[PDB]
Design a protein around this nucleic acid. Structure first.
Ligand SMILES: Nc1nc2c(ncn2[C@@H]2O[C@H](COP(=O)(O)OP(=O)(O)OP(=O)(O)O)[C@@H](O)[C@H]2O)c(=O)[nH]1
Ligand SMILES: [Mg+2]
Lengths: 14, 49, 360, 31, 21, 707, 48, 95, 13
RNA sequence: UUCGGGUCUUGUAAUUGGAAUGAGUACAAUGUAAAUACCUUAACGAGGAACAAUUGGAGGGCAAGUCUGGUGCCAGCAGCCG
């Protein structure tokens, strides 16, 4: 459900 | 010019969209799909509702 | 990625402003001289909240963690939850949502779970009776912050439901050039997991200070026991000076540390409230950034607010320089013709910002 | 399992729509 | 010629009338 | 109730409004230039030749106008001049009647918000008989009253006796357009725009020689302002129409070349141009500064003013001991808190009651503003406007430039960087260069949910994924829309065409603009391939904005039953494997006859067969179907028209249509012949009689038996 | 009351697959309801 | 005369019902909001928001099978041109 | 007869 | 109103023919202070006589279409969307 409806994402790098 | 090379790559995208719009429709993009028409064992990956 | 910024200062404010405008920003050198250089867990969680509430936005974080790059998107909102890390409380994670509440595509219904008080940030009663009337003055009608469970430091376990429905287009302009007259002093003295003798003693100390004045004083006791009182015990008190003729509020609060005195806390909070009233002109020093941001995003028009030279501090200068760097909107200050005090009217030509997300 | 979840989702959305329309027609008749 | 005269449809402007006799 | 309205905001300067902008438009050779030279000789008493570009004359003591003879063949010129224009001198040939170009321009004006239309009629001397002339006058006037409002007055002109129309009719037309009295519009009173009067390149010729005529040159642009005060800080984005989207590099206001003679004599009165009275340049003959200085640290600012983190929320108090010692007493804020002695007591009781009531019914504004909610709203509008006015009038240097920006009617120049060599080379003054300052929502890029219909006079409907050169906001660009409907408000199923007499939703990629925004799109902007058809293809509005849509195209799976019992059937040729049938098992299935079912279990021995239980005995001849949904995507195409960058400035050609590429590649219209419709003739069927069991027929009683 | 004729248009019914014309006359709902009524009558008299 | 506030019943399922035909307009000489019928969901597409409709009475003689009681006004013109003309495609709605 | 019955049912209801 | 009863050259998006005429354009003359027009009249001017009148009201029918409820195959709402 989450990966189907949402669009924007965070580029987390460490 | 920057405009000129931009128009060149726009013309490339134009050619691609022309060829796609004149080409054949996808098996899923059609309607009334028959099993021999569509590729074999596709629905398990296509995951429609 | 284009508008650059330095330092870890006013982080949530810069994120909120870039989300409102739309210009892509880039903060660099976040605590370089540190043993752990870069962000913190609560700042990363706040960015997770931002990307939860908005849509199409991209947040690039460098692997060192010292450089964040924000290309904002549109505001959507909806109904969801959030899990506050225990380093910072729900007030610190609520205030940006109070900025970005009424300009969404769908209503806000966010369930925050965590600690609900600290010495630095707003409590729940602080948020309600200090910053909900300002939004109600600026046009947001149906906003509410229910408290399902109340937690306390240092274990928390509390839950608040922020609901905002007044999807306004832009905040109406404001013309408040007269110093308001405070009508009543309401307050909320709350506590968790202790005997309410403490709450009674806090209210006794506060009324003991405020016995000099003649205006009415009503401070309600708010005890929480049982299963919806959270883990840790604690107490705190907020006072609001309410001007009922115009619907203005000046608030001041505190909580009690491990082994403090409730009467001392009541008298200290009353003294802080009197200080805020004496330094106040139509707003408080903590409601002021909300009022300035709302005046800048109000429609293309001159808004006027009567502020005081004591309310003009370094925090005001830093806020105004940030607003100039984002919105290119100067704030004009004129000294009022009054001879006794030294107030200045702030005039802001609010730019055209419309709630362009909302379907019609 | 997916059939179960889909039936549950459809029933939830139908109940929400029915409540919304009842509220709208109530507001019409009282306003 | 080079001039584009208007259609009979947009000259007379009878939008959507039923069939009569 | 006729005089009531919807309230709106008029952002025009009361001090020095800019020249009103009139567009002289119409067919190729309908004397559209002669009208301009004769109207100018009326207004200023000097004959003019070689009119090109905008030309500003001055009417009366307070007015000045800007004539724009539009190039009669270019639809993009029609579109942006209908975006900007304010009074449209639309001229119709008399002998020929209405023409398609006049028709199309009226439609784009109607969709982009109607300016003051004014018809003039020409070639009224070619009519042989006075009665044919009178009948044709009445016919034109009534069709014009159908399109523009009824009662709209249009003028009539005779013949060009000396390169000029009759003076009496020109005098009437001049009086009318000099008392024209315009009205507010939403787009024009939300955005800043300008019509560039003079154009100049800015580089060094040595730089041009070194780079070899490829470097994008700086450009200075001179003209008046309109609409909304342009902010005086450099680096705001502003779309030049037909050239691209640039940003202003430097702004500066100037002395305007044509000051109205009221303003001229007022300047002369303050101080103590009468021959040059037209302007065709393209043609020939302190805490505030303490805060906003960046080099000063805020500590030093507060230090000089008197003589810190923001992530924390509470303010910086002092020690509680000092606070209590200071606030033992409250008589410093007692002022903020709330015969001769009797009179003072009644006065303080009046003050106490005044602070008790406050603002409850204070004139209520209703009987104050004469018992109409509309008048109340517009009085609020006017009060806010005059407060704006006095606060602007407060100070000169910053309250005019830094705070509000250059208002309107300030003859301003602006320079841009990175402006194409094609623009500077193929610039000709016969074309309008209009500029619109954008917004955040207009600088973003997403997909818009619009709702649109085919235009009523357009013949052919619009196919999904067919390129549409549309105009929405200041931008014209072709995109690949997708025409959707909601299947009774449950799901956005895409159609394959436009419904020919109503609105369908559309969704398409392209630069965002606000909700509620009307737009219109053509299919062919290229003038070389137009024909007699109507150009304008779609009208609509844009409703909302997103970055993605859950958009469905229905696909149904067919099978064929090959062995049937009562209520059960073995179905083949629908899947490929038992894994697929297990993935789809438990399915609400139905057949062409209209009986329901479900697929139950995968059959083992053939690869794809299964068993399905129907509600009634299915025939063998019928075809089962399984309705399901498949997500489609929106193609991300965006190709803005750049005709002013083009040299020919007509015949801009982009993505051809599907019929055009089929005809050019010489393919054929794809159509499976099993899908066409036939005229069937269903024969009457005579069902077989009933056949009882023989045990029943034996065991039946004597009377009730088959005899 | 307020209806266009193009709204009142017509909708033709398509025919059997030409590759599957061995089994003839793809049956629609009117034929199905006739067949079901006759079968129901037979079942009733048989039960009697 | 009135201003169209919101098109009610847009989120209904079954088409051409009375709760879908309804709108909510506010009369301008009173600031007072009240509902109004609009025939033909096409004409519901024509009326969107901030539109200055011209209501008139309803004047029914008999009820219908799904009519709403108390909705006594209907919409005659929108933004200056007639709804019937816009529906029959004689005219065009000018923004 | 069936058409008359349909028109009759409409004229009752 | 249901079982039904009454009565009669009827029906045709079937073919086909020559005659008539003014709406209109127009020499002309009359009219008029001068015109326009009417009334007159050469010459043109009719087979979707496309030389293309309306405004309202009632009702039916249709799909491998859509939505909702069900004591299957039904009912309701409706359908420019297959
Ligand atoms: N008899 C007559 N001739 C006219 C009239 N109006 C224009 N003309 C003729 O048309 C020409 C004037 O047309 P322009 O003023 O150039 O119109 P335009 O739109 O500039 O034409 P383009 O230059 O082709 O764009 C002159 O040669 C005139 O003789 C009129 O009312 N009567
Ligand atoms: Mg010319």
């Amino acid at each position: 459900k989450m990966m189907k409806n949402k669009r924007g994402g965070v580029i987390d790098k460490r | 010019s920057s405009f000129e090379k931009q128009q060149i790559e726009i013309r490339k995208q134009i050619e691609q969209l022309e060829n796609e719009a004149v080409a054949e429709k996808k098996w899923s993009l059609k309607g009334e799909v028959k099993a021999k028409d569509r590729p074999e064992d596709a629905l398990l990956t296509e995951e429609l509702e | 990625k284009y508008t650059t910024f330095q330092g870890s200062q006013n982080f949530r404010l810069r994120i909120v402003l870039a989300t409102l405008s739309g210009k892509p920003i880039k903060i660099e050198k976040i605590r370089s001289g540190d043993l752990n250089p870069g962000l913190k867990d609560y700042e990363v969680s706040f960015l997770r909240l931002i990307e939860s509430v908005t849509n199409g936005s991209v947040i690039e974080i460098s692997y060192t963690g010292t450089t964040v790059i924000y290309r904002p998107g549109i505001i959507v909102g909806g109904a969801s939850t959030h899990i506050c890390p225990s380093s910072k409380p729900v007030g610190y994670f609520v205030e940006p949502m109070l900025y970005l509440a009424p300009f969404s595509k769908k209503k806000f219904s966010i369930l925050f779970k965590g600690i609900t008080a600290s010495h630095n940030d707003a409590g729940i009663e602080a948020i309600k009776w200090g910053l909900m009337p300002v939004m109600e003055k600026f046009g947001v009608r149906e906003c509410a912050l229910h408290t399902l469970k109340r937690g306390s430091p240092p274990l928390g376990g509390g839950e608040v439901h922020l609901v905002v429905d007044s999807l306004i287009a832009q905040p109406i302009t404001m013309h408040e050039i007269d110093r308001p007259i405070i009508s009543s002093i309401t307050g909320v003295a709350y506590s968790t997991r202790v005997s309410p003798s403490l709450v009674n003693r806090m209210i006794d100390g506060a009324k003991k200070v405020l016995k000099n004045l003649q205006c009415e004083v009503n401070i309600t006791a708010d005890v929480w026991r049982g299963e919806n009182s959270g883990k840790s015990p604690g107490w705190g008190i907020t006072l609001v000076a309410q001007s009922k003729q115009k619907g203005w509020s000046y608030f001041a609060e505190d909580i009690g540390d491990a082994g403090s005195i409730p009467e001392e806390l009541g008298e200290k909070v009353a003294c802080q409230l009197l200080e805020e009233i004496s330094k106040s002109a139509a707003v408080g020093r903590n409601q002021l950034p909300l009022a300035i941001v709302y005046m800048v995003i109000g429609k293309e028009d001159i808004g006027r607010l009567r502020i005081n030279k004591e309310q003009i501090d370094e925090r005001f200068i830093i806020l105004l320089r940030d607003i100039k760097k984002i919105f290119n909107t100067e704030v004009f200050l004129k000294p009022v013709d009054e001879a006794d005090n030294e107030d200045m009217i702030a005039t802001i030509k609010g730019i055209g910002f419309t709630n362009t997300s909302k379907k019609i | 399992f997916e059939a179960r979840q889909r039936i549950e989702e459809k029933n939830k959305e139908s109940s929400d729509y029915h409540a919304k329309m009842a509220h709208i027609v109530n507001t019409i008749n009282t306003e | 010629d080079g001039k584009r005269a208007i259609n009979y449809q947009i000259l007379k402007n009878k939008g959507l009338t039923p069939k009569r006799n | 109730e006729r005089k009531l309205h919807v309230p709106m905001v008029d952002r025009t300067p009361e001090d020095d409004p800019p020249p009103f902008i009139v567009a002289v438009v119409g067919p190729p050779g309908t004397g559209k230039t002669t009208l301009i030279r004769s109207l100018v000789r009326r207004m200023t008493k000097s004959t003019l030749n070689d009119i090109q570009g905008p030309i500003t004359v001055v009417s009366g003591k307070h007015r000045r106008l800007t004539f724009l003879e539009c190039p009669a063949d270019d639809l993009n010129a029609m579109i942006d001049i209908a975006k900007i224009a304010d009074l449209v001198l639309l001229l119709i040939d008399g002998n020929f009647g209405f023409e398609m170009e006049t028709m199309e321009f009226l439609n784009i004006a109607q969709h982009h918000g109607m300016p003051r239309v004014l018809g003039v009629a020409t070639h009224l001397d070619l009519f042989k008989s006075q009665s044919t002339l009178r009948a044709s006058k009445k016919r034109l006037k009534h069709r014009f009253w159908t399109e523009v409002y009824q009662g709209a007055k249009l003028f009539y002109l005779s013949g060009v006796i000396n390169g000029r129309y009759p003076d009496r009719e020109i005098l009437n037309l001049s009086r009318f357009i000099s008392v024209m009295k315009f009205r507010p519009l939403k787009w024009r009173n939300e955005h800043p725009y300008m019509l560039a009067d003079r154009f100049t390149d800015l580089t060094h010729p040595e730089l041009i020689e070194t780079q070899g005529l490829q470097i994008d040159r700086k450009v200075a642009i001179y003209g008046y302002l309109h609409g909304t005060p342009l902010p005086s800080a450099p680096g705001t984005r502003v779309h030049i129409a037909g050239v691209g989207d640039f940003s202003v590099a430097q702004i500066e206001k100037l002395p305007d070349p044509c000051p109205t003679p009221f303003y001229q004599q007022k300047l002369d009165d303050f101080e103590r141009d009468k021959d040059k009275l037209i302007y065709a340049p393209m043609s020939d003959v302190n805490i505030g500064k303490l805060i906003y200085m960046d080099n000063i640290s805020p500590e030093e600012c507060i230090r000089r003013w008197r003589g810190v983190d923001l992530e924390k929320f509470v303010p910086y108090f002092d020690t509680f001991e000092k606070l209590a010692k200071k606030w033992k007493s409250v008589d410093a804020i007692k002022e903020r808190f709330l015969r001769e002695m009797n009179a003072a007591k009644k006065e303080k009781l009046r003050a106490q009651f005044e602070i008790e009531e406050g603002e409850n019914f204070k004139e209520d504004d209703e009987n104050n503003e004469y018992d109409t909610w509309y008048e109340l709203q517009k009085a609020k509008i006017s009060k806010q406007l005059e407060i704006n006015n006095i606060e602007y009038q407060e100070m000169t240097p910053e309250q005019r430039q830094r705070i509000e920006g250059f208002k309107a009617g300030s003859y301003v120049r602006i320079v841009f960087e990175k402006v194409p060599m094609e623009f500077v080379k193929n610039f000709n003054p016969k074309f309008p260069i209009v500029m619109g300052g954008l917004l955040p929502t207009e600088i973003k890029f997403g997909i818009v949910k619009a709702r649109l219909r085919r235009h009523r006079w357009h013949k052919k409907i619009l196919k999904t994924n067919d390129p549409l050169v549309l105009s929405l906001g200041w931008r014209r660009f072709q995109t690949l829309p997708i025409y959707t409907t909601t299947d009774s408000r449950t799901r956005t199923r895409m159609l394959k065409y436009t419904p020919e007499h109503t609105y369908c939703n559309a969704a398409f990629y392209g630069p965002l603009c606000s909700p509620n925004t009307p737009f219109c799109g053509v299919q062919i902007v290229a003038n070389s391939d137009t024909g007699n058809g109507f150009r304008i293809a779609a009208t609509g509005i844009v409703e909302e904005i997103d970055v993605n849509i859950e958009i469905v195209k229905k696909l149904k799976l067919v099978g064929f039953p090959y062995k049937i019992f009562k209520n059960t059937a073995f179905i083949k040729d629908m899947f490929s494997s038992a894994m697929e049938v297990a993935r789809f098992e438990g399915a609400q299935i139905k057949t062409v006859s209209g009986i329901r079912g479900e697929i139950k279990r995968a059959l083992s021995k053939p690869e794809g067969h299964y068993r399905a239980a129907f509600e009634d005995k299915i025939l063998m001849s019928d075809i089962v179907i399984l309705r399901s949904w498949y997500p489609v995507r929106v193609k991300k195409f965006y190709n803005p028209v750049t005709s002013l960058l083009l040299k020919e400035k007509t015949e801009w050609k982009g993505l051809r249509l599907t019929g055009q590429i089929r005809a050019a590649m010489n393919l054929e219209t794809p159509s499976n012949p099993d899908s066409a419709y036939h005229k069937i003739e269903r024969v009457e069927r005579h069902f077989n009689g009933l056949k009882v069991p023989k045990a029943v027929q034996k065991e039946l009683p004597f009377k009730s038996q088959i005899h | 009351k307020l209806v266009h004729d193009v709204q009142k248009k017509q909708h033709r019914e398509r025919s059997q697959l030409t590759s599957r014309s061995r089994y003839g006359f793809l049956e629609k709902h009117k034929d199905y309801v006739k067949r079901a009524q006759d079968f129901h009558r037979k079942q009733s008299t048989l039960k009697v | 005369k009135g201003i169209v506030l919101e098109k009610l019943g847009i989120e209904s399922k079954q088409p051409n019902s009375a709760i879908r035909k309804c709108v909510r307009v506010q009369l301008i000489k009173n600031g007072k909001k009240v509902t109004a019928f609009v025939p033909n969901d096409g004409c519901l597409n024509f009326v969107d928001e901030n539109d200055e409709v011209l209501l008139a009475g309803f004047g029914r003689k008999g009820k219908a099978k799904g009519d709403i009681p108390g909705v006594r006004f209907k919409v005659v013109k929108v933004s200056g041109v007639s709804l019937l003309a816009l529906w029959k495609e004689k005219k065009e709605k000018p923004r | 007869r069936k058409e008359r019955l349909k028109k009759l049912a409409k004229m009752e209801e």
